[PDB]
Each structure stands twice: as C-alpha cells, then as structure tokens.
Design a protein around this nucleic acid. Structure first.
Lengths: 260, 182, 60, 144, 185, 134
RNA sequence: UAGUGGCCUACCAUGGUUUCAACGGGUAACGGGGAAUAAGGGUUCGAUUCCGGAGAGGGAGCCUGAGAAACGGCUACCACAUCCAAGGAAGGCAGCAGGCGCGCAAAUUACCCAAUCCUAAUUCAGGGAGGUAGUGACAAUAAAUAACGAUACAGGGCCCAUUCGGGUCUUGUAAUUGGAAUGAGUACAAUGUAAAUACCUUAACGAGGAACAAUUGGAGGGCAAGUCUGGUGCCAGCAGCCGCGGUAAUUCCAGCUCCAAUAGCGUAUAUUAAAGUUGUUGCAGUUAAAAAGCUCGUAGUUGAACUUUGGGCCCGGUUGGCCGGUCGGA
C-alpha cells in the first residue's frame, strides 16, 4: 500500500505492551533500529506507564529532551525507540538502573540491577561470516557488527559484548547442559539446560529443552538463546527465575501463600 | 435511473431563475405582535444585502431585492393583520407560508387558533415555520428553552411537517430562508 | 389543546382538576404499588367461578 | 442399504446429492433465484409509500361484505399498482386521490382478509401523519 | 475510531408468555419481595441460565482435568462469598438445585427486612432510595445491591439525612418555623 | 474540611522533574467542595514547600459525602512550575498570563488567508491600490 | 526487470485441462475472527471500530522520490460542471460539519490540541487523525411514579384451653385519620473541565393524593381474563387460522370492568428455532407424491478367509483395613 506504515492502531499492538483498551485510539509505533517491530517495547511504553515517572507524552519528552535516560551506554532521546531484549537502561536520575528481560509471561518488567553487569550486554551471534579484505566478523542479534572474532566461534553461540566499546570478551559454545533462554514463540521467558538438537535438512531445527522443574518443551532453534552452564547465568535474572508456574499455582501463590 | 434523471430535469424549468421566476411568500403571524417589518429586517440582519435598504415605510410588497449569494429576485407579501379577505384568497399562487410563533400572546382560540384553522383547511401550500421572537430569549435564565419547545410542539399539534422552529439568534438561519426559496 | 395555557408543562396539570372523573379514586398507585395491589387481589383468599370461566369478573 | 451410499469416499456423491434436492424445497428456490427481487412489488422491502390511485372496485375473493373503502394505490419507488386497505374502517372523507400512504402487510404477506383482489397491505401512515393517533380523534381518517 | 466497547443483555424473555400457570406462579414472588417487574425476576432467571449452563458443562469432562479443578473451584467459592450457596452444600451439585428466592433474598431489597430495622418491605424500599441506610461508609443506593455476606453485620444509618441522627430536613423549616415553634412567631 | 485528614498516600518523588506528586485525601463532612486555591494554600506550608510549588487535579468525591480523592503536585523549587506545569493550570492559577487567542476556526482561516501570497505582501499594498482606482 | 519466469522475442516440439468436473454462465460476491443460534450436529448473514485487498467519477499515463501507475500530485481522453470583462482561466466532500436527490431508512456548517498519538530542522509549531459538547427510545445497564400505626368490625386460629372471658395478630371495608419525613425540579458553593455542561458533592428553597398521577395492546379457541349492562340485531362489525351476530351476540358499537408487559409495549418484512418438511447423524416410495420395461456395461462405490497365545521371576504407581504403633492420616 504505497510504501511503509507510520501509525500502529491500538489493538494492533502486540499484547505484551499491555496497553489499556480504552483511553485513546492508537499505539506509539516503534521506530526502526536495534530490534524487531513486534517485540520492541519502545521508550514511552517503558517510562510513563510501567514506571510512571511521566504522566503523559509531553512529560515523557520533557525527560527525553533533557538527556537523562540512557539505553546501552548512549543518550538515546527518541520516544518510539525500540529498546528491546537484553538492552540495559541506565538513568541519570536518582541512579536506579534497569535491564530488559522478560518475565515468564512473555512480557517485560522493571528489573533494577548492579553496576558489574550494567557495564556490558550480550547477544546471540546470528551470523559469522567472512567479509571485505578477508576479514572474519560476527553479527549478533540486535545490530552489532564486531570484527575479527575467534574463528572457533560459529553461528548460534553468544558473546559478552561491552558497552563502552564493542569488544567481545568471552563466549559460550552450543551443546547440552547450557542454561538457555527463549526469545519468541510460545514458551517465551523460559530457561533450563538444552537436551539435544534436531537437524532436519532444509527445515526447522527445533530443540528439546528441560527446565528447573524438569519440564521439557520444544521450541524452534531461531528462538533458543544459550547463556550458560549447569546453573550459571551471566546476568542477574529477575525474581522468579523464569520457570513457568501454571495458573493453578498462581492461585496457590498469589491466593494460598500471600492470601492467608 | 436515467429516466429518473429525466424526472429530475423538466421540473427545473418553471421555478429556477429570474425571468418570470419570483415567488409569493405571504407572512401572516398567529400573533397581533411581531409586526413583520422586523421579520423583513431584524431577521435579515444576517443576510446584510440591501433588502435592508428597501425595508421601507413606503411598503413595497414587491421586494425584488436580488440577494447576491443565491441569485434570485423575491416577493414577500407583508399584509396587515386585519385584512382577512385575501390572506385566505391570495394563497393560490402563494407557495411559501410562514407562521409567526410567539409565547408573548397566547395563540388565540378565535384569532390565532382559528387563523390556524383558516390557513390550514384551505390547504397549506408550504408551511416552513419561523420563530420570529426577538424579545423572548431572556424570559428565564435557568434552562430557558421552554420558550422554544412550547412553539416547536405547537407547530406540530396540527400541522407537524417541521421538526424544529428556528430562533432569530443563529447566523445562517436567515439565508436558510433563501435556501428555502431557491 | 392549550399548549402555553395548559400543557407546556410535562406534568403538573396532567389533569389535576379536583373535579374527578371517578369519584376521588383515580389513584392507580403506579408501578411497584400497582403490582402490590394486584398481589393483594390474587393472594388473600379469592376464587371466582368454578375453575374455568368467561372474561372479566361478573356474575354467572 | 436404505437407498444411499455410505462408504467413506462417497461424499462426492452426497454433497452433490443434497445439492439437487434443495431445489425441491420451496423457499430455497424462491430465495436463490432472486425471485423476491424480480417480483413482489415491495422488492424485498418492509414498507412502501405511494399515491392513492382511486376508490376501489370490489371483486369477490371472499368475504368481508361491503365496499371496503379500499384504495387503489401505485407506489413511487417502483410504480407497480396494488390494491390496499385501511383498518378501523369507514370515515371515507379526509384525503383526496394522488395522496400518500405507508403500506405494510396483514400477517401472511396478506393475501386474504376480505372480498377484495390482491388486498394484502394495511396502510400505516397517511401523508406522514399516523393512523393510530388519527383514529384516536386527534386528527381525521382519510378517504381514497 | 476507538476500541469497541462491549455490552451484554441480562434478562431472558420466556418461550410462552400466555402460559397462565407460570404467570400465576411468577406474580407469587413480586409482592412477596416488593419488586417492580418480571424483569426483576428475569434478572435472577438469567443469572441461573449461565450458572446452570457452566455447571452442567464442567461435569461432562472427567476430573484429573485441572480446568474443572480451577474454574469450578472459584465459582464454588464466589456464590458462597455472596451468601446464597451454603458452605455445607458446595460440590457444584446443590447449585443446580438452588432457585430464585435464594438469590433474590440475599439482597438489601430484602436484608433491610430480615435483620431488623425494617417496618415494611415498602417503608424500607423507599429508604434505600431516600438513603436512610448504609454499609461501612458509602450508602448502597440500589436494592439489588447483593450484600456480599459480610457487611450484613455492618448495617448502619446514614449519618446525614436523619433517623440515624444529625439533621432536620426539607419540610421542618416550613413547619417547625411556622407551627411547632412559631405559633408565636 | 472538618476532620481535615490530608493523608499523603501513594507518594512518588520524581527527581527527573523535581516533583513530589501524590494522591490527596480530604474528608469534607457537612460542607461543600475544597477548592483549587483553597487546599493549595493549606497543604503547601506543612508539606515542605511554598504556594507557587503547588498544583491540583483529580478531586471529585466518593458517593455520600466527606471523602474526596485528589492528586496534588508540589515541586522542589518554584521556577520548576514555570516550565513543567502545563500552562492551563497556571492560567487556572494566575501564575501564567493567558495570551488570548482568536479561535480555532479563525486562526485556521487566517493561516489559509496568507498562504495565498508568496513573500511578505508589501507590494500589493502599492501594486493594485493605485491602478484600479483609475 | 530490483530479480525467477513465455514476462516478452527468434526458431523448435505438439502439447496442456477435464465427468475426480475442465471450460462457459449467474452472484442483490471484498475476502478472514462476529451474529442469530443454543442437546449435539446443521442453518443463514459478515458494508461496518482489527488484518489483508481494492478505488478516489470511469479507463489510460507519467514525473519527483528509498518508496506512488498517488489523485486535499500531474498530463490526456471520457461523463459532468462553476465565474467570465467572452480572453483560461479554474475542479473531484467514496475526509469532517453541512446541502440536494434517493429511500421506510440515518445527527451540529460547535469547542480544542488537555488526552492517544503522528509529522517537522523540532522540549515550543501543526493536526476535523482524535477528544469533548449538541441531535439521538439503534442496541445496553441500574432505578421514579410513595409510609407505618390507632379507631368500627369479618373471621382463621388462638390466650389461659374451666375454653362459656374479652380481643393480644392480621385479611380489607374504612377516604376519618396522625404529625414526622422527602427526591425529579430551582440554588449559593466549590469541585468538575483546555473552556463550559452534567454526574458523584453541598448549604438555602420545592408532597399528600386534586399530589409531581405510566402508558401500551387485548378481552370466542389456540390464548389467562364476565356469558355484566345498555344502544346493534347481517346493518356494519369480528376473523394471523378457525369461529359468531338473523334478535336469549361471551365473538357488533359503547359504558364499565378486567388481563398482560411495563418507560415500555405493538406492527411490517427478513432469518433462526420448534421443522426427521433436506434427513451423514436422521426421513419417505404395495395402496397417501415417489422402483422405474427388462438385461449387458464403463467411471464411481464397496469386496471372501490367514499371519507371535498361554504362563513364570520380580519391580509393587493405586486400593480394600482386621492394622490402629499418627488419634482428619499410612
């Protein structure tokens, strides 16, 4: 329809933004950049209505035209900026700093963090390739093009990328035992030490994956996200640790535990 | 539908122009007040062409003021209230008939309601009601709109083919008169 | 009738003539009290004619 | 075998079988040929308004025994001439010919309430004003 | 255009309006409870529709199904919380035996009557809407309030608008400033 | 506002706009509403700041009388209000001078009435103003 | 071409689709969640707040540009059609608010960027996108249109059952009551809002039945509710289907009076349901409509019977409880 789109209707947002059905007509459509449109979570969906530091849009831009907030070591100032998965948000406020990693619900939350791990970020190396002048390089999941990597690093691994300058420090291979995190599909926000791979020449590569409570589930491999070992995450994961409690046992936790 | 197009062409022959196309509009109020020298003038203070200038003590009654926005010469018969012998008799060429509705005088059971029954039961050619009340917009300050509702229903207790009956305080309702003519 | 003489009001004179049509009993006590009077009509004692009967109370 | 195939490949027959037996149903063939659009002078409507042609001549398709004060009418959305009817009958005084109605059926698309041919449409509202507040002796009940 | 607001339609009109035994057995509860319409009764008889349909739908699936063990175990724990279903009789079996007077009684339409301060189901029906009635703070201005089993104990007067003390009103000051005091003005 | 009870609940202290924003209780009993610039000089001094660092919106009642739930702002300085308050509320306060506009339709007419001239329109004051006068 | 390609083009080959329904025709056909349904299946509709497609009156065509076969862009044709000083010169409300015409059938030429957002070089500007107000019985929700005694009794009980002592309690007749008491409506007041309405708020003021009065359809069967009384006795009437009036009308005009639903009840068409009258579930063909004149036959639809039982070693997830050593539980 004659080139691109600029508006996103309310109810045409993804459900993980959790906008209210009334009070408006539209959604604050995310700009292009380091993430997908469909799992963006822009700046104003984070600020005004999940942290409530602003009450409406003009007060959001009152922050953003005052150079306070930071998204991964830079001074991003645009309202619809897609700070997506794994992106550290640091404030120049009363200095409380946050990550962007989901709950088990497939939805983002507020997760305040330390300064050991505010300093860096991660990424699924979605491509390793041999570009110009015979230079090997790697392309992670968001946008980064890191030159000259370890040649023993292949596709589907992960890195430990810094935020001051984009330097890979160490990596994680792909095998069993690897503490993992899913980005997409249904079991979004899960965790739990990959069982094994399935090759399926020309097709999807799915993967069998356990959890903490030993509850297997099979994603696709373009959503698997390896970040560890037998109990070794490389960030500070939020309260609840990603393991899916069922809705029978959140009417046993929110109802039978905190409800006396 | 083209025949229906032809149905909507030949009827646009006799009524649309200036050369032998000017219509009799006879203004007879139901009230002895409201005196249609202001109905010609204070109503048409929103039109502001020169039907104001010939709104004259030399009563013309052939008011061929070519109003410069809907392109028509006119004719408004302004009769005195008492000459009851042609008001019911000049109404064979007179298309547009306008009642004068007022809450000041109660519409009388021998004057007003019987002028209703006299203009009515000869067959009203076209009854486009106008509230011509200038001195009735402040008889209350506490939801005052009963001065209009009592007249909009009174147009509908016998001859109901108007929905609202218009105040003299909105702008385009004076050239809605010339819309009603053209 | 007389609009600004009698009936420009929604109602004060619905017809509030103390000259009554029915001899000072026009009060069908509307709504909830109407169905209350009908509950007094049907639930105290009454039966009228022989189970099956014609069509609005009268002698046989 | 009850005159039908059953085996679990025979649906090829069956949805072609019922396909040729729906036409023996009545309103199916009435509906899917647009016969309500090629006929039925409402044209699939629910009401129609039209001028009264004239007073009506009674042709006995039984029984209501009088000249039933009925109105030959011809519509203006179509122009297709139908005999009509007024309830609360009588009062043949209060509109001329070539004057307006609003038509609506009797309950079966009419077809029978009196000895008059094709009288199937109650008049609802003459000239925009009603009949039920005009048999109520507020206004007056029309003529042909 | 904004996101479409949804809206239900809560009364279920009957199959046969001219069924005389039903109409006689439907008027039996109007003046008993001091109601206004058969729509009042249609409210309850439309609640019974969805409740008695979900109850019969959940029994058709055999337990070890945790859906039956979740959606049933809160419905069974909700009508208790109103005060209609009884605590001893909750296995979603008695809920199909529950009837119209049970829901229609657990209402401050009634419950102004059968825990004192009544003087009629008319004298107090006018005092729901004259608001000489209360709960913990906020006057429950509608007789179909469906008292949730607990503020029953918290029945109180309005502190404004007397017979709970603290005022005279809108007719004393044409009368106790002319007759009851001002015989001599 | 007898039994005054201005209970400061749901307090968020924003550093990023230098604001102390919170919802406000006010128990009325037996008298009417508790105005803009009537609480605004009463909660100001006992809550850490001045009268120009006060702002008010919310504020209706609950059913029956007495309790009204408002939402009050009180800023960490005073010229904070001159830049972060929306200008309608200082027009509602007198801390702003309302530059009186014409209308919506009038400005939209005037925008269109000068888009039909390329430049500044100084020449047409002398161009056609002398020729067709003949 | 941005690129695959009969997409063309030049020579070749003679193919390809089809009774497994080609091709052709009609659509009152924009496709997907929805609706009415409600034993289940089936049925009919889907312009419509979301997604995708298409168009800016109908067909072409091209520029700028990352992006358009763009129309609040352009050129031409075709259909219209404005002013004119007779010399172009001007133009697309299938955007908003309005007009005409068409219908049965559908709002006000308001206020404003406060909000949801979008665009810009950009905290600042613009936005009929949008929100708010006005019309609005589409559809939906909650609820007005009024109290409790006393007093004359009727009783049902019943009090102590020496009931055989009168009324503790009520059913209504009671218009005799009895003062206290209030809202719809008018209002300071301030909240309410970008500015105002209202709506929770709130002091002052406004009720007695004449108050401040709830209508709408029926009153022969299906279909509650009189064979009541007058005028009416085929005269109209009444009838969705049947059925009465010819003079003893429960069915006519009226007076009563009553019956339902209740600020809501009718009517018109359309669909669904009951409708095993579309039947795969789940009909029917001797006579009620329906077995053909009888064989041969192809496509289709089915198609005879056979292929590793009985028992041992334990593991014991679950239950019976004499065990009860825990006094609802192993």
């Amino acid at each position: 329809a004659r080139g691109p789109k600029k508006h996103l209707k309310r109810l045409a947002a993804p459900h993980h933004w959790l906008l209210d059905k009334l009070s408006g007509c539209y959604a604050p459509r995310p700009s292009a950049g380091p993430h997908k449109l469909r799992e963006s979570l822009p700046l104003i969906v984070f600020l005004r209505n999940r942290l409530k530091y602003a009450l409406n849009g003009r007060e959001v831009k009152a922050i953003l035209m005052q150079r306070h907030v930071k998204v991964d070591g830079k001074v991003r100032t645009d309202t619809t900026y897609p700070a997506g998965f794994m992106d550290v948000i640091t404030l120049d406020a009363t200095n409380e700093n946050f990550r962007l990693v989901y709950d088990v619900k497939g939805r983002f939350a507020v997760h305040r963090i330390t300064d050991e791990e505010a300093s860096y970020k991660l990424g699924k190396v979605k491509k390793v390739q041999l570009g110009k002048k015979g230079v090997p390089y790697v392309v992670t999941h968001d946008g980064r093009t890191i030159r000259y990597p370890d040649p023993n690093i292949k596709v589907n691994d992960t890195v430990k990328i810094d935020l001051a300058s984009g330097k890979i420090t160490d990596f994680i291979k792909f095998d069993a035992g690897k503490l993992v995190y899913v980005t997409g599909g249904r079991n979004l926000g899960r965790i739990g030490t990959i069982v094994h791979k399935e090759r399926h020449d020309g097709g999807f590569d799915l993967v069998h994956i356990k959890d903490s409570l030993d509850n297997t589930f099979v994603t696709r491999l373009n959503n698997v996200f390896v970040i560890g070992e037998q109990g070794k995450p490389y960030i500070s994961l939020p309260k609840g640790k990603g393991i899916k409690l069922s809705i029978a046992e959140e009417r046993d936790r929110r109802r039978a535990q905190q409800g006396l | 539908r083209a025949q229906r197009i032809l149905d909507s062409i030949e009827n646009r022959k006799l009524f649309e122009g200036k050369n032998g196309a000017a219509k009799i509009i006879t203004i007879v109020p139901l009230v002895n007040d409201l005196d249609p020298l202001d109905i010609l003038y204070k109503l048409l203070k929103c039109a502001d062409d020169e039907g104001i200038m010939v709104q004259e003590v030399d009563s013309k009654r052939i008011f061929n003021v070519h109003i410069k926005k809907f392109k028509s010469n006119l004719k408004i018969i302004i009769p005195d209230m008492t000459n009851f012998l042609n008001i019911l008799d000049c109404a064979k060429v007179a298309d547009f008939v306008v009642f004068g509705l007022s809450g000041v005088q109660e519409v009388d059971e021998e004057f007003g309601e019987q002028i209703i029954r006299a203009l009515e039961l000869q067959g009203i050619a076209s009854y486009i009601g106008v509230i011509s009340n200038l001195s009735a917009v402040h008889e209350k300050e506490k939801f005052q709109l009963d001065v209009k509702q009592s007249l909009e229903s009174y147009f509908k207790h016998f001859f109901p083919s108007e929905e609202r009956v218009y105040n003299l305080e909105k702008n385009s309702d004076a050239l809605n008169v010339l819309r009603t003519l053209c | 009738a007389k609009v600004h003489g009698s009936l420009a009001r929604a109602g004060k004179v619905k017809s509030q003539t103390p000259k009554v049509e029915k001899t000072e009993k026009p009060k069908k006590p509307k709504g909830r009290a109407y169905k209350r009077l009908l509950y007094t009509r049907r639930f105290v004692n009454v039966t009228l004619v022989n189970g099956k009967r014609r069509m609005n109370p009268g002698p046989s | 075998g009850k005159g039908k195939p059953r085996g679990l490949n025979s649906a090829r027959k069956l949805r072609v079988h019922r396909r040729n037996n729906r036409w023996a149903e009545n309103n199916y063939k009435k509906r899917l040929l647009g016969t309500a659009f090629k006929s039925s002078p409402f044209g699939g409507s629910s009401h129609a308004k039209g001028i009264v042609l004239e007073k009506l001549g009674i042709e006995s398709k039984q029984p209501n025994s009088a000249i039933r004060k009925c109105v030959r009418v011809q519509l203006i959305k179509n122009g297709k001439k139908v005999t009509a009817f007024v309830p609360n009958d009588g009062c043949l005084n209060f509109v001329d010919e070539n004057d307006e109605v609003l038509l609506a059926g009797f309950g079966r698309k009419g077809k029978a309430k009196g000895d008059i041919p094709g009288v199937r449409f109650k008049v609802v509202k003459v000239s925009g004003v009603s009949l039920l507040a005009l048999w109520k002796e507020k206004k007056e009940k029309p003529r042909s | 255009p904004r996101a479409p607001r949804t809206y239900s339609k809560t009364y279920s009109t009957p199959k046969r309006p001219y069924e005389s035994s039903r109409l006689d057995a439907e008027l039996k509860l109007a003046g008993e409870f001091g109601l206004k319409n058969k729509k009042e009764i249609y409210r309850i008889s439309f609640q019974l529709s969805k409740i008695r349909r979900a109850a019969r739908d959940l029994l058709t699936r055999d337990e070890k199904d945790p859906k039956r063990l979740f959606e049933g175990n809160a419905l069974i724990r909700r009508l208790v919380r109103v005060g209609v279903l009884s605590e001893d009789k909750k296995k979603l079996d008695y809920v199909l035996a529950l009837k119209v007077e049970d829901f229609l009684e657990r209402r401050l339409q009634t419950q102004v009557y059968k825990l004192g301060l009544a003087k009629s189901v008319h004298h107090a029906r006018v005092l729901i809407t004259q608001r000489h009635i209360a709960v913990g703070k906020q006057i429950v201005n509608i007789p179909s309030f469906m008292v949730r089993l607990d503020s029953e104990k918290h029945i109180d007067f309005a502190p404004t608008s007397p017979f709970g003390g603290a005022r005279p009103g809108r007719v004393a000051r044409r009368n106790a400033a002319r007759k009851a005091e001002a015989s001599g003005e | 506002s007898d039994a005054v009870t201005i209970r400061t609940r749901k307090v968020i202290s924003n550093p990023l706009l230098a604001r102390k924003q919170f919802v406000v209780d006010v128990l009325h009993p037996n008298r009417a509403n508790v105005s803009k610039d009537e609480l605004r000089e009463k909660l100001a001094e006992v809550y850490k700041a001045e009268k120009d660092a006060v702002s008010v919106f919310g504020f209706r009642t609950q059913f029956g009388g007495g309790k009204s739930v408002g939402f009050g702002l009180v800023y960490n300085s005073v010229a904070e209000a001159k830049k972060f308050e929306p200008t309608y509320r200082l027009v509602r306060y007198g801390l702003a001078e309302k530059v009186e506009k014409a209308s919506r339709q009038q400005r939209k007419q005037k925008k269109n009435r000068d888009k039909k001239i390329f430049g500044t329109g100084k020449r047409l004051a002398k161009k056609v103003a002398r020729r067709n006068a003949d």
